[PDB]
Amino acid sequence: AQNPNCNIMIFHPTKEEFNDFDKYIAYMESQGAHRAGLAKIIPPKEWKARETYDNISEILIATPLQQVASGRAGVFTQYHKKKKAMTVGEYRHLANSKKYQTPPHQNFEDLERKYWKNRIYNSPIYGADISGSLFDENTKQWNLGHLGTIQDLLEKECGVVIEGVNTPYLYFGMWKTTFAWHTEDMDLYSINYLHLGEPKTWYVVPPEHGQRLERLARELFPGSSRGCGAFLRHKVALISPTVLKENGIPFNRITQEAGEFMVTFPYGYHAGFNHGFNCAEAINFATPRWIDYGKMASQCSCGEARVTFSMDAFVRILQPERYDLWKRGQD
Ligand SMILES: O=C(O)CNC(=O)C(=O)O
Ligand SMILES: [Mg+2]
Ligand code: NI
Ligand SMILES: [Zn+2]
Helix, strand or coil: CCCCCCCCEEECCCCCCCCCHHHHHHHHHHCCHHHHCEEEECCCCCCCCCCCCCCCCCCEECCCEEEEEEEECCEEEEEEEECCCEEHHHHHHHHCCCCCCCCCCCCHHHHHHHHHHHHHHCCCEEEEEEECCCCCCCCCCCCCCCCCCHHHHHHHHHCCCCCCCCCCEEEEECCCCEEEEECCHHHCEEEEEEEEECCEEEEEECHHHHHHHHHHHHHHCHHHHHHCCCHHHHCCEEECHHHHHHCCCCCEEEEECCCCEEEECCCCEEEEEECCCEEEEEEEECCCCHHHHHHHCCCCCCCCCCCCCCHHHHHHHHCHHHHHHHHHHHC
């Protein structure tokens, strides 16, 4: 078995190997990359996502989210308070202000220490989940707006044509902006490209050990657990590496820098934080290997998780027993 310790693997494809996306994902899996839940892909030196980032300031962040924490430094939840619209140029200036900017630090480890010590005492503002793309239309390789769709994968594998679409999303971050512990909708893959700015630190639990994280989460968030049998779908709970280590949960960490891709694999729980002003683009995708994970994915039916139009068909076809109850949650 390849990668039996479930380490995060880092790949350096050549420009030739960067042509065929599906083939390269299958290659990484042949080497055991999925066992980690997360892999890094450094693009060939010849590749670029677009020519420059000099003209992005007028993108609108219609609903910036203030991430307010509750709990203790290592075990907390966050809620998202909606703020007034602002442009990316306005948001960059805010991220660089004295109130929100990255503090002085020695290295990524010192910054990580500061994040876990101090996150709860601040409420950073995240421009998340913005439909759109920063890839130039002429970028042919690993263009996250030109991937094969999940609906087409399901049709190819299973023969059933379904409604729905699959487009990318932009994320504008600042120091301390946080992504809570989660797997993807329907335990899909994700791919995330850090277009510009400061790094993003990731934490990940191997898919084979995801239920250990779930059991810890039920213990740490006991009211949320009684409220919903899949409350990590709400995407609000944070647990620090120190707490994970104290409770014996297998996990790994890595820092993504600008110009790098990350892939999350089906049922790979992940969480993390941004180091400073940045912009990422991410989208879900599927492969043949996903179908079995899609069939077994948990679902939130309490009503909190509320997701896209396109998830309907995935539930309806892959999980017809759950359909009814999950749709009640969605309406
Ligand atoms: O970058 C973020 O805030 C969160 N991204 C992801 O969870 C992802 O790409 O799967
Ligand atoms: Mg612009
Ligand atoms: Ni994710
Ligand atoms: Zn729920």
